[PDB]
C-alpha cells in the first residue's frame, strides 16, 4: 500500500513545436488540414532504424525549417521562467547594482 511502481510523454521546448501546438489549441488552423499538410516530402523520409552517423547530420542539415510566431516565443520564455528566476534579491539588488553603475 506504499509501492512506488510509478510513461511516454513530450516536452514542448522548441519554438517550432509551440507554433504548431498553438495552432492546434487555438483552432486557427484546422486539425484535419494539419494532418493533410503532414504528408509531405519530409515525413516520407523515415528515420526508423538509421545509424547515428547518418541521423545526426540529417537533423542538423536536412531538417525542414517551419515558421515561428512571436506568441510561441513568449510562451517558451514563460515556460523557461523558473520559480526563482526573479526573487526579491534578484529584482532589487540586481536592479540596484545596475542603477549604481549608471550613477557612477
Amino acid at each position: 500500500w506504499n509501492s512506488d511502481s510509478d510513461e511516454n510523454n513530450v516536452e514542448i521546448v522548441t519554438a517550432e513545436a509551440m507554433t504548431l501546438a498553438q495552432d492546434i489549441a487555438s483552432r486557427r488552423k484546422s486539425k484535419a488540414d494539419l494532418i493533410d499538410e503532414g504528408y509531405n516530402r519530409w515525413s516520407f523520409q523515415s528515420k526508423e532504424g538509421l545509424p547515428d552517423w547518418f541521423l545526426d547530420e540529417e537533423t542538423t542539415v536536412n531538417k525542414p525549417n517551419k515558421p515561428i510566431t512571436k506568441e510561441a516565443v513568449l510562451a517558451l520564455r514563460e515556460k523557461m521562467k523558473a520559480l526563482n528566476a526573479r526573487p526579491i534579491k534578484k529584482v532589487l539588488e540586481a536592479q540596484g547594482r545596475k542603477k549604481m553603475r549608471t550613477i557612477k
Partner: protein
C-alpha cells in the same frame, strides 16, 4: 550455544579485519559474511549485519562508480563490489518490509541511516532513500524515525550542489501523493532544512615531468573556473526545481485543508522570499481565500501574510496588495480567541502555543516602520485589553508590556478612546479627547499578581 555464538563473532571479526587490510583480494569473504548472517541466531544476524555495514563503509569509494588489469580488473572489482552492495540492500528491504524482531528492525534502520549519511553519493542511493522514506510515510512513528530524519536533515545541510537533496525531495513528494499529503508534521520540516534554499625539499621532477606538471596545472585551473560557473548554474537550477516541487506540495496541502496546514504555512513563509515577485502578489490571495480550529488557521494566514509583507525592500518593489484585509481579520479574530479556552500544559509561523504568535504578530506589527501608532494602534489595543480578560497573567502582562514599551505616547488606550471603526462592535466614543476601565475589573481576578500588575500599569 554461547561458545558457538562467540566462535561466529570471532570468525566475523577475523574476516572483517582481513577485508580492512586487503579489501581487493578478499571479495569472497563478503559472501562468507552473508552465509554467516544466514545463521538462525538473532544476535549473530545483528552482528553480521553490523560487520557488513562496517565493511561496506570502509571499502566504498568516495566517488560515484562510473558504470561500464589496471582498468579492467578495477572495473570487475567495482562491478563485483556493486553486486554484494545490491544483495546487501536487497536483504535490507526484505527485513524492513517483514515488520525480538523489533530490535533487529531497529538495527536494520540504524545501518540504513549509516549508509544514508555516508554512501549518499554512491550508486543505489535511489533504492536506499526509498526504503528509508517508506518507513517514515507510515501513520505512526516507527522506531528509528528520529535517526532517519536526523540523517536526512544532515544530508540537506551538507548538500551544497543540491542533486542529492533534489532526489530526496522528489521521493518525499511521491510519498505525499501516496499519503494524500497526510504525514507527520516533522516530515514537512525536512524541506526547511534544505541548505540550498537557506543559503539566501620538493621531490625532483625530470625535464619531461615539469612540462607535464605545468600542462596539468593549466588544465586544473581551467577546470576549476568552468566547474565554479557550472556549479553556480546547476545549484541555481536545482534550487528552482526544489522550489517547484516543494511549493506544489504545500499548495496541494492547502487545497486539501487537512491538519498539516500548520507546516505548509511554515514552509511558505520561510521560502516566500525565494520565489518570484509576481508570485508574491498572488500568494496572499490563497491566504485570504480561506475565511469561510478555524480561528487558529486564520491566525496562521494573517501572520504569514505579515511575514511575506515583512520581506526587505517591499518599499522599492511596490507590490501593494492591501494587506489591510488580513489586518481586519486579526482585528476580528481576537474575540473568538478570548472566547475559547487555552492550556499551556507543561514540560505554524515559527513556534507553537497560539498565544505566542499573537504577541509575535503584534511585535512584528510594532516593528513595522511607522506603519502604526497613528491612532490605529490604540483602537487595536482596546480590544486587546478586552480580550485580556482571561488567559494566564504572564500572557496578559505580555500584551500590556507591548504597549508599555511602545514608542507612542498615547495613554487613553486602556480607557475611553477615539472612534473604534474597522468592524466596530465596541464603544466608539467619537471626538472625546479626554485623558481619563478594564484594569479596574482586572484587579479582582483569581491570581493575586494580576492586581499588582494592574497597579503597576496605572502608576506607570
Amino acid at each position: 550455544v554461547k561458545q558457538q555464538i562467540k566462535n561466529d563473532k570471532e570468525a566475523l571479526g577475523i574476516q572483517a579485519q582481513q577485508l580492512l587490510e586487503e579489501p581487493v583480494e578478499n571479495l569472497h569473504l563478503i559472501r562468507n559474511i552473508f552465509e554467516k548472517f544466514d545463521s538462525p541466531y538473532i544476535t549473530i544476524k545483528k552482528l553480521s549485519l553490523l560487520t557488513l555495514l562496517a565493511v561496506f563503509r570502509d571499502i566504498i569509494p568516495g566517488y560515484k562508480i562510473r558504470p561500464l588489469k589496471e582498468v579492467a580488473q578495477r572495473w570487475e572489482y567495482e562491478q563485483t563490489l556493486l553486486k554484494h552492495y545490491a544483495k546487501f540492500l536487497q536483504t535490507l528491504e526484505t527485513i524492513l518490509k517483514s515488520f525480538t524482531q523489533l530490535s533487529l528492525y531497529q538495527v536494520a534502520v540504524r545501518c540504513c541511516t549509516k549508509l544514508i549519511e555516508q554512501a549518499s553519493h554512491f550508486n543505489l542511493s535511489e533504492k536506499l532513500f526509498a526504503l528509508a522514506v517508506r518507513q517514515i510515510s507510515h501513520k505512526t512513528k516507527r522506531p528509528g524515525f528520529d535517526g532517519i530524519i536526523n540523517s536526512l536533515k544532515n544530508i540537506f545541510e551538507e548538500d551544497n550542489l543540491g542533486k542529492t537533496s533534489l532526489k530526496c525531495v522528489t521521493i518525499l513528494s511521491r510519498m505525499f501523493k501516496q499519503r494524500n499529503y497526510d504525514v507527520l508534521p516533522d516530515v514537512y520540516d525536512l524541506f526547511l532544512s534544505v541548505n540550498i534554499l537557506n543559503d539566501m625539499d620538493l621531490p625532483y621532477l625530470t625535464k619531461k615531468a615539469r612540462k607535464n606538471y605545468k600542462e596539468t596545472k593549466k588544465i586544473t585551473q581551467e577546470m576549476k573556473e568552468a566547474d565554479a560557473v557550472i556549479t553556480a548554474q546547476d545549484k541555481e537550477k536545482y534550487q528552482s526545481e526544489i522550489l517547484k516541487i516543494i511549493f506544489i506540495t504545500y499548495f496541494k496541502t492547502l487545497q486539501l485543508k487537512g491538519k498539516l496546514i500548520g507546516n505548509a504555512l511554515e514552509g511558505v513563509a520561510r521560502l516566500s522570499h525565494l520565489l518570484n515577485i509576481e508570485f508574491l502578489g498572488d500568494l496572499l490571495q490563497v491566504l485570504r481565500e480561506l475565511v469561510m480550529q478555524a480561528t487558529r488557521e486564520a491566525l496562521l494566514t494573517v501572520s504569514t501574510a505579515f511575514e511575506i509583507a515583512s520581506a526587505q525592500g517591499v518599499g522599492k518593489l511596490n507590490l501593494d496588495l492591501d494587506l489591510g484585509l488580513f489586518v481586519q481579520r486579526l482585528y476580528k479574530i481576537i474575540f473568538p480567541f478570548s472566547l475559547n479556552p487555552d492550556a499551556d500544559l507543561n514540560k505554524v509561523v515559527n513556534a507553537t502555543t497560539e498565544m505566542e504568535m499573537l504577541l509575535k504578530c503584534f511585535q512584528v506589527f510594532f516593528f513595522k516602520s511607522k506603519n502604526i501608532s497613528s491612532s490605529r494602534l490604540s483602537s487595536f489595543s482596546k480590544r486587546l485589553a478586552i480580550a485580556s480578560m482571561q488567559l494566564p497573567e504572564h500572557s496578559a502582562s505580555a500584551d500590556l508590556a507591548l504597549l508599555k514599551k511602545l514608542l507612542s505616547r498615547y495613554s487613553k488606550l486602556s480607557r475611553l478612546l477615539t472612534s473604534e471603526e474597522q468592524i466596530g462592535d465596541g464603544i466608539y466614543n467619537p471626538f472625546i479627547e479626554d485623558p481619563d476601565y478594564e484594569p479596574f475589573l482586572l484587579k479582582n481576578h483569581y491570581s493575586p499578581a494580576v492586581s499588582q500588575s494592574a497597579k503597576e500599569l496605572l502608576k506607570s
